[PDB]
């Protein structure tokens, strides 16, 4: 016991100023604790205002706080338990359990703020991670070790998509996985924890393959602003010290930026554009750059990205693009056609779509599919105005083929059975390319449009074609 004490001097919403004796201040990013009637209240030092006073941010609700109340310096950043002991557990922002299964009995804890790996620690690999999802694996294929963002305005299917990923990827994956819930719906989290148990991925009386870190929107900005790093640290630990493969699921990473937004002014910063904090770029940088494959081990991350007001050029998402190896852009226009997943086949991109990585044929199919749809998009002016009548014959066929193709890009997810009542179909990457190849050369021009919609591989196109013609 050599404990440092301070006193609360202000509370303004989520900002709590604390005062300490002579030059003996806890450093920025340190955690402080206040022992309250129910549990404790964690603070995080944000500035040194001067005159022995610090500005903090609260990892909880600040009501009930009394000025002049004792504050305690933990001596360092917020700590999380790490390692295999977090497997099968649910954790809140401050490395405390919320599953009521008792205390997380790990040997090490770790600071949630940490430095991002040096330029010289980086590891470039063009390896390909098969999703099972036709449009991704064909057009914008996800990279093992990569980073992978899912852009989408509200309710276009991000969370469902990401769960379809977990449904597939997270079984076939030999290693461990962290899921971070950053400012989503407490009930979504509820489902996941009950799915994990039933998929088997979690097992409360045996071995588990995943850690759960939650900080949903029912929680104040400070909390919603750090729980990403809480999760991210657990991952880091398996990457660097279990020297192995991780899968890092963040839903939804936009709320890290938003939460940053909600306290910015209370910390006394002039707003930048679209009323976002001045530190948007570097703050996102300072997090994203830790989520990374390095020589000690590999992370592969799937981050849902909320696109506010469906505006992609909104400073927040617009910044995130630079951070991802593969971008899956969900579109309202697409989803409104009943085409699930709502993936925009043109605006979606992945670095791995290069002949050197996937072969020429794959790259050629993928390019042609794109040309097709691009043409079909370009002609939608002349179709509206002068009908389908006023068209070149090649064009008439390009459109015929584009429409058939649009549909073959949809697919029943397993997760989304509640919505389609249609059984989840998973498609193999080679089966994807072959069927699109076939479609493209016209070896299927006779089959009606509906036969390609909400089915798996070309088997299912034939099966449906006949079942309907019956």
């Amino acid at each position: 016991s050599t404990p440092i004490t301070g006193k609360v001097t202000a509370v303004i919403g989520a900002i709590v100023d604390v005062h300490f004796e002579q030059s003996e201040l806890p450093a920025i990013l340190n955690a402080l604790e206040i022992k309250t009637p129910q549990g404790k209240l964690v603070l995080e030092v944000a500035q040194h205002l001067g005159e022995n006073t610090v500005r903090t941010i609260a990892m909880d609700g600040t009501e009930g706080l009394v000025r002049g109340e004792k504050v305690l310096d933990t001596g360092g950043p917020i700590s999380v338990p790490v390692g295999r002991e977090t497997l099968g557990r649910i954790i809140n922002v401050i490395g405390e359990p919320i599953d009521e299964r008792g205390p997380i009995k790990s040997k090490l804890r770790k600071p949630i703020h940490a430095d991002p790996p040096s330029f010289a620690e980086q590891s470039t690999s063009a390896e390909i991670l098969e999703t099972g999802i036709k449009v991704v694996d064909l057009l914008a294929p996800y990279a093992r070790g990569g980073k992978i963002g899912l852009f989408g305005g509200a309710g276009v299917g991000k969370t469902v998509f990401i769960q379809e990923l977990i449904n597939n990827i997270a079984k076939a994956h030999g290693g461990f996985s962290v899921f971070t819930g950053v400012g989503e719906r407490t009930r979504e989290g509820n489902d996941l924890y009950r799915e994990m148990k039933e998929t088997g991925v979690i097992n409360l009386e045996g071995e588990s393959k995943v850690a759960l870190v939650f900080g949903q929107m029912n929680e104040p900005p400070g909390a919603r602003a750090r729980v990403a790093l809480t999760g991210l640290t657990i991952a880091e630990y398996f990457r660097d010290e279990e020297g192995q493969d991780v899968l890092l699921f963040i839903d939804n990473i936009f709320r890290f930026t938003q939460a940053g937004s909600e306290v910015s002014a209370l910390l006394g910063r002039i707003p930048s554009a679209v009323g976002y904090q001045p530190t948007l770029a570097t703050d996102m940088g300072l997090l994203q750059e830790r989520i990374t494959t390095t020589k000690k081990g590999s992370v592969t991350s799937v981050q849902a990205v909320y696109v506010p007001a469906d505006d992609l050029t909104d400073p927040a998402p617009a910044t995130t693009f630079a951070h991802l190896d593969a971008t899956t852009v969900l579109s309202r226009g697409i989803s409104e056609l009943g085409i699930y997943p709502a993936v925009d086949p043109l605006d979606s991109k992945s670095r791995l779509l290069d002949a050197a990585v996937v072969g020429q044929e794959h790259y050629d199919v993928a390019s042609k599919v794109q040309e097709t749809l691009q043409t079909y998009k370009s002609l939608q002016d002349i179709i509206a105005i002068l009908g389908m009548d006023e068209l070149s014959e090649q064009d008439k066929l390009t459109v015929e083929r584009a429409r058939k193709i649009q549909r073959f890009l949809s697919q029943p997810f397993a997760v989304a059975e509640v919505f389609t009542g249609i059984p989840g179909k998973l498609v193999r990457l080679k089966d994807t390319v072959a069927s699109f190849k076939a479609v493209l050369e016209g070896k299927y021009d006779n089959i009606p449009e509906h036969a390609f919609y909400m089915v798996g591989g070309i088997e299912d196109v034939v099966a449906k074609a006949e079942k309907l013609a019956a």
Partner: protein, 102 residues
């Protein structure tokens, strides 16, 4: 506030609380601050529209834009059975009715 609505588990008494917040837009703009906020907080929306209203659709629900994210899970089985595909169909209908303008 809105998270305070939930459907408790059996251990906790199975009680529910269900929320219908209301939000008023201007000039149909849903991309203004607050609506955007709440739109992404809730489990779906019902969009009402003035144009729809005056041409006689009342409730002036906009099927095109209205969703319930729970979906069929909360429909009555009978209603579900005969409503198979209606919402998608009603979309296809606006589709053909837009092409009708030619």
């Amino acid at each position: 506030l809105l998270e305070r609505a939930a459907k408790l588990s059996e251990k906790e008494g199975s009680g529910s609380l269900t929320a219908l917040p209301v939000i008023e837009t201007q000039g149909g703009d849903v991309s203004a601050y607050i609506p955007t906020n709440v739109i992404s907080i809730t489990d779906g929306q019902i969009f009402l529209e003035a144009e729809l209203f005056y041409k006689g659709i009342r409730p002036a629900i906009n099927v095109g834009l209205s969703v319930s994210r729970v979906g069929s899970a909360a429909q009555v089985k009978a209603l579900k059975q005969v409503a198979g595909s209606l919402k998608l169909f009603l979309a296809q209908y606006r589709e053909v009715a837009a092409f009708a303008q030619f």
